[PDB]
Amino acid sequence: ITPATHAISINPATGEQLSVLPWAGADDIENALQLAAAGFRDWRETNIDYRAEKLRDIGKALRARSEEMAQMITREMGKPINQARAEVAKSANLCDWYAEHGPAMLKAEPTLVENQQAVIEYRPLGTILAIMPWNFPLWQVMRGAVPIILAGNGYLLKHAPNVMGCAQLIAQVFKDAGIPQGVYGWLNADNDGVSQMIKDSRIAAVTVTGSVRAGAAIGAQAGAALKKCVLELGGSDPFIVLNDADLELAVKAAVAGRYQNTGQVCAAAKRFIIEEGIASAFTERFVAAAAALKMGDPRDEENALGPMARFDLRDELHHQVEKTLAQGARLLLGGEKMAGAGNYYPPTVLANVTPEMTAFREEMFGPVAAITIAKDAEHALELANDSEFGLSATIFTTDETQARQMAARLECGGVFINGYCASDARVAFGGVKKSGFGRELSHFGLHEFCNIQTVWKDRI
Amino acid sequence: ITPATHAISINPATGEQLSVLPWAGADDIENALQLAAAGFRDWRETNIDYRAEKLRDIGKALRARSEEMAQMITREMGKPINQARAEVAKSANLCDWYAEHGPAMLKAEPTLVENQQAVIEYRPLGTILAIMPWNFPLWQVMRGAVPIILAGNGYLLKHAPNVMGCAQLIAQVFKDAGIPQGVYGWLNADNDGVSQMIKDSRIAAVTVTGSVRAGAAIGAQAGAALKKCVLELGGSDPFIVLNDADLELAVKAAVAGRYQNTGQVCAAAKRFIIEEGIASAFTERFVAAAAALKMGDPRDEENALGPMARFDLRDELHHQVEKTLAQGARLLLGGEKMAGAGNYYPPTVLANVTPEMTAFREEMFGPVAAITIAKDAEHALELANDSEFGLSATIFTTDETQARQMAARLECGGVFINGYCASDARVAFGGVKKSGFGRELSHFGLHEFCNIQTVWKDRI
Ligand SMILES: NC(=O)c1ccc[n+]([C@@H]2O[C@H](COP(=O)([O-])OP(=O)(O)OC[C@H]3O[C@@H](n4cnc5c(N)ncnc54)[C@H](O)[C@@H]3O)[C@@H](O)[C@H]2O)c1
Ligand SMILES: NC(=O)c1ccc[n+]([C@@H]2O[C@H](COP(=O)([O-])OP(=O)(O)OC[C@H]3O[C@@H](n4cnc5c(N)ncnc54)[C@H](O)[C@@H]3O)[C@@H](O)[C@H]2O)c1
C-alpha cells in the first residue's frame, strides 16, 4: 500500500506501520459537503451564548480524553509525551478562553455615523475548509476550529495523511461534546479532492497551515474560485543576541526555542544571529546546553527530544546539513542520522553560517541550529530580515529602547523581547512574505472568517 | 493605433479620440518597481503625524485642481459634471477624515497578557499594487491610496486604460502635494505587466476593484505568488420593498440607487424585489420617476444621466436587455440605443423579471432596472440571496424588527434599511460570494494592508 491510494500512519520511533485509510471517493466528498451545508444552515441561526457554552463542552470532552489523545499524538508523529500532554492542555484551555472572551469580540461595532444609524455586524461566512499539518495534530486544528465555529461558521478538516488517528480521535471529542457533524467535520481527501472542494459552492473560504509549496498551490486555487484564504506557512525565525544581553537567559530561550517538538515548529528559533563581541560566549554555552538534551523513546518522560515525525523529512534535513557543511559551515554538535529502526536525529549545531548557505536560506524543520555572527545591531537586523520567511523573531538586549526600534523594523508578525517565543490565545499569530498572510488567535482569528457587514438605517 | 498597443481615451458623448498611451515596456516596469521599493524604504520610517499632515496636503492639492479634475472625469467617461464635482469633493474630504481619525486607529493595542507585557502593533507591509476601474476614476483610487499610504505603505496604480488622463492628473496632484518619489506611482501596464509585477518581490500585496472575471484572474495570481489580495468585484444588489413600506421614499431611493452615475455603480440597486401587494403601485411610480430623469451632454448640469462610458459596454447592456425580453420580461421604459455619435442609453425598466432571466443573473452595469415580484417577505429574502453576487442590499419596510432579521440573513456586506445605499469613510465596504472578500474604509481599509505584529516583552 502506497500514498497513491491511502493515508498511512507509521510510528517514527519504531518504523512499525500503524494504520491505513483509503482516500475519500466521489460519494464521500459529496456526502461531506451535503452534511456541512446542512449543518451550517442550522448552526448560523444559533445564539452566541449557546455556542460559547458548547465551546466549554468541547473543553470538557477533550480533558476527559486527554491521555488517550496525548498517546495518539506521540504514537503517530513522535512528540515527547509530556509535550503532547501540554498540547492537549493548551487546546482545552483555548476552548474556555474563547468561551469567556469571544462573545464580546463578536458584538456589533458602533460607528461615527450620527444618530446611531450604522453599526458593524460580524456574520458567519459559511463552511471553512481547513488544511492542516502533523507537527501539532491537535493544537493546529483547535487554533482555528474553536474561533471559526464560535463565529457561527462550519469547519471541515483535511488533516495531514500521517495523523489520521489523531483526526479520528478529534472528531470523537467533538461528537462527545455535542457539536453537530455538519459543523465540525472531516474528510480523508487527496489533493484532487481538495481541489474539487475549493471549487464547490458549499465551501465559503479556506485556511492552510503547511509548507510554502502547499500554500502557493492552495492559495492559487482559492483565488481562482474567489474564496478568501488565510495562509500560515512556517518560518525561519531569527533569534538576535546583542552584546549587552542577559546571556544565560538568552541561551535558555535559544535552546528551548530551537529544540521544542524536536525542532518541528513553524515559529521555532532557527537562525541565531549573534553580535560579534558575545558570539564566542553564546556559542560555547549554547552547544553545552543543547548537548544536555536527552533523546529517545518519546514515551519515556526523561527525553527532551523524540524521533522526527517523517523518515523522508529526516533525510531532507540531513541533506540540508551536508550541503551547509560543504558550503563552509562548521559542525559543532550532532549532524548525523542515528542508526536503527527509529527516525532519530540528534541536537545539531552549525556555526559560520553565512546568508549564502542552505541552512540560512531554507527552513530547517528539525533539531538543527544555525549560528551567524553579526558585526553590530544594524547588521543583525539586516541579517534577520534577509529571508523569504517572516513569521516571528526574538531579540535579547538590555537596551529596551533599541529593542523597540528593532521590533518596528523586523519584517515579521511577532517579536519577543528577552523571552520565549510562543503562540497564545491572547495575541495575534501569523507572518509576512512567504510565511503567508492573515492572522490567527485573539479577535483576529474570530474575524478573519466573518462577513463584516455594515447595517445602516435611515440614511436619508 | 489599436488597443493591442495603446491605452485609448474616447469621449463617450461625442465619439472623438482624446489621447493614446503605449503600454509600459520592460524598462518602465523595472524602473517603477525600483522607485517603489526605494520610496517605501524611506516612507515607512516617517512619523505617523507627519504622514497625516501629508494627507491634508493631498486634500489641498486636489481641491486646488478640483474643476480641472471634474472636467477630466466627465470628458473621459461621461459622468454628469455635478457628479464628477461631488466625486472630487468626497475624495478630498476622505484625505482630511483619515488625517483626523487614522492615527488613533494605528496606535498600539493592549492585550489581556498580565502586567502589560504584550501589545499589538500595526506596521507597514510594503508597496501595494492597485488595479482600478473607470466608473469612479478618482474615488476608487483615493479610497485605497489614502489609508494605504497613511499606514506607511506605498501605492502603485494600474488604472483602467480609458481613463489615463485621469490617472496622469491624479499623479500631478500627488506631486503637487509633495508625496515622495515612489510612495505614489503609476504604470500603464498591460495584463502581462500586471502578472510580472504580482510575481515580483517588490510588490507586497494586491488590491483589485473591477469585474468578477478580473478578480478571479488576478486573485489566482496573487495566491500563487503568496501575496494577500482584497477583491471588490461586481454587485447585483437587491432592493426589497415590502407591503408596509414608505412607498414615496422607497421610490425616491430606488431611482437614485439604480440611476446614479448612469447606472454604473458596483453597489447600485439592480434587482428590485417587490412584495406582491405593493408591486403595482411601486412599479407605476418607479416608471414615472425614472422617466423624469433628463439625459444628455454631461457638461450640462440639467442632465441627470450622461452617456455610458464605453461603446462596447452599451452594446453588451442592450444585448442583455434584448435577451431578457426574449425570455419573457416586459419593457416598461427605454430599452433602445439612442441614435447618434454619443454612447447614450435611456433610463430603462424591465418587469416580470424571473430568476432564470439574464437581467436577474448578470450584473446590469447601466441604467436598466429589473423588477421581480415576491410572494411575501420570505420569498423576497430567497430571491435576494439567489445571486452569485453579494455586495450590498436595501430593505424598505416600516417593521424594523423584520428588517433587522432579514439583514442578518442577507448574504452581502452592507444592508441599508429605509434609506439610500452609498459608500462612506465611516463604515466598512465590501461583499461576499463572487463580489469578493476583504473590506475597505473605516479602520478596515487601514488595517487590511498592515502587518499586524505582536510585540511581547519578558515572556518567561
Ligand atoms: N506548521 C507549519 O507551518 C508546517 C507544518 C508542517 C510542515 N511545514 C514545512 O513543510 C515541510 C514539508 O512538510 P509536509 O511535507 O508535512 O508539509 P505540507 O505542506 O506537505 O502539508 C501540510 C498539509 O497540506 C496538505 N497539502 C500539501 N500539498 C497540498 C496540495 N497540493 N493540495 C492539497 N493539500 C495539500 C498536506 O496533505 C497536509 O495536510 C516541512 O519540512 C516544513 O518545512 C510547515
Ligand atoms: N466592489 C467595488 O468596490 C467596485 C467598485 C467599482 C466598480 N466595481 C466593478 O467594476 C466593474 C466594471 O469595471 P471595468 O469595466 O473597468 O472592468 P474590468 O474588470 O474589465 O477592469 C477593471 C480593471 O481590471 C483590469 N483588468 C481586467 N482584467 C485584467 C487582467 N486579466 N489582468 C490585469 N488587469 C486586468 C483592467 O485593465 C482595469 O484596470 C463592475 O463589475 C463594477 O461592479 C466594483
Residue numbers in the entry:
A (entry chain B), B (entry chain A): 3 to 462
Question: What does the article say, verbatim?
Answer:
The NAD(P)+-dependent succinate semialdehyde dehydrogenase (SSADH) Sad is a member of the ALDH superfamily and oxidizes succinate semialdehyde (SSA) to succinate. Our results show that Sad is a surprisingly flexible enzyme that is not only able to detoxify succinate semialdehyde and glutarate semialdehyde but can also functionally substitute erythrose 4-phosphate dehydrogenase in pyridoxal 5′-phosphate (PLP) biosynthesis and glyceraldehyde 3-phosphate dehydrogenase (as well as phosphoglycerate kinase) in glycolysis under physiological conditions.
Moreover, in the Q262R variant, E4P dehydrogenase activity was increased 17-fold compared to the WT, reaching 800 nmol min−1 mg−1. Both variants were also active with glyceraldehyde 3-phosphate (GAP), showing even higher activities with GAP compared to E4P. GabD showed higher activity on SSA than any of the two Sad variants (164 ± 9 μmol min−1 mg−1) but was almost inactive with E4P and GAP, indicating that the promiscuity with phosphorylated C3 and C4 sugars was restricted to Sad. Compared to Sad WT, GabD only supported slow growth, likely due to its lower activity on E4P as well as the rather unfavorable intracellular NADP+/NADPH ratio to operate the oxidation reaction.
